[PDB]
Amino acid sequence: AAPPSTREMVQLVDSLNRREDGGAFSVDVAEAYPDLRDSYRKICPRPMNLILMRQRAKEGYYTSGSATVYGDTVAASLTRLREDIELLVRNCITFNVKVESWVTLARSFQAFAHRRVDDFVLRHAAFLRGTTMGAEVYE
Ligand SMILES: CCOC(=O)Nc1cc(-c2ccc(C)c(NS(C)(=O)=O)c2)nn2c(C)nnc12
């Protein structure tokens, strides 16, 4: 089972940018708002955004060394990318807990991103067809 190439992983992370999110999951809140860094660290002490995820994809961090590429199921495959997607969503829903519309946007992105990763895993690993999907597990 050959892992996906770094170019394919970069193309996968690039496909997670949606026009309807208007860069909400791409912006680096620390670089964009220097005068609010410390408040964002209190709420989201672990940083995550699609710029960091694209660097990780490009460098082989999701598909090299001890990264889990193919697991027992689609859901349990590309675990490092799934954890990064989950942190991105957790940070957004925690920060926006009082703004329901922006929580719903983060949940919409979560479902969308795990489905994009599920379909990508299936394109590279037909032997995982029919197993648990990340879109069924992550919520
Ligand atoms: C100081 C002003 O701050 C903000 O405007 N903040 C945020 C704004 C938006 C936002 C804007 C425009 C649109 C069209 C949407 N999409 S929708 C209708 O689905 O909600 C969302 N999202 N957002 C998210 C996530 N997290 N923070 C923000």
From TrEMBL:
Q: Which residues form the Bromo domain?
A: 17-103
What is this protein's name? Bromodomain family protein
Q: Tell me the stretch of the parent sequence this chain holds.
A: 162 to 300 of 652
